[PDB]
């Protein structure tokens, strides 16, 4: 099954600035804002679509991310959680399709479409009770909010 949800968050951060933090600068920001994460390592690829990242955290553990698509001109980026810690056993992957829109007063709107790829025909209550859709956006956006000059 594929169960899709739409999440939205307004931000005061300028669109291109927010998008940069979420894409080009994510690997640097993530280990700061989520303390147990030590590093984000590119294990396959050149940073564009198709690129695989290993997120290493400390017990040492890892999570795998795949960059599925990116379109800087349209402030869109798509990535998936494809293995490792924090991926429910009922799930093949979690995919995120995000777009940063202009908002009023030079702000932004984050449009986040989260897709749960389930092994079965049901999205469990445990998964539904998830912040899986907005968590990482929220942590990065809050970092740039507080630290525009990072």
Curated annotation (Swiss-Prot):
Family membership: Belongs to the BetVI family.
Binding-site positions, trans-zeatin 1: 7
Protein name: Protein LlR18A
Native organism: Lupinus luteus
Residue sites binding Ca(2+) per the record: 31, 37
Compartment(s) of residence: Cytoplasm, Cytosol
Biological process terms in GO annotation: abscisic acid-activated signaling pathway; defense response
GO MF annotation list: abscisic acid binding; calcium ion binding; cytokinin binding; melatonin binding; protein phosphatase inhibitor activity; RNA nuclease activity; signaling receptor activity
GO cellular component: cytosol; nucleus
Pfam family, one: Bet_v_1
Inducing stimuli: In leaves by pathogenic bacteria.
SUPFAM superfamilies, alphabetized: Bet v1-like (SSF55961)
């Amino acid at each position: 099954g594929i169960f899709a949800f739409e999440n939205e968050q307004s931000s005061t951060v300028a669109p291109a600035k927010l998008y940069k933090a979420l894409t080009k600068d994510s690997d640097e920001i993530v280990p700061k804002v989520i303390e147990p994460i030590q590093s984000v390592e590119i294990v396959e690829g050149n940073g564009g679509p198709g690129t695989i990242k290993k997120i290493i955290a400390i017990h040492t553990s890892f999570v795998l991310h795949k960059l599925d698509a990116i379109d800087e001109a349209n402030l869109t980026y798509n990535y998936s959680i494809i293995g490792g810690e924090g991926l429910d056993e009922s799930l093949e992957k979690i995919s995120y399709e995000s777009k940063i829109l202009p908002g009023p007063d030079g702000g932004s709107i984050g449009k986040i479409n989260v897709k749960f790829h389930t092994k079965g025909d049901v999205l469990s209550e445990t998964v539904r009770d998830q912040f899986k859709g907005l968590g990482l956006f929220k942590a990065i956006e809050g970092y740039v909010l507080a630290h525009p000059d990072y």
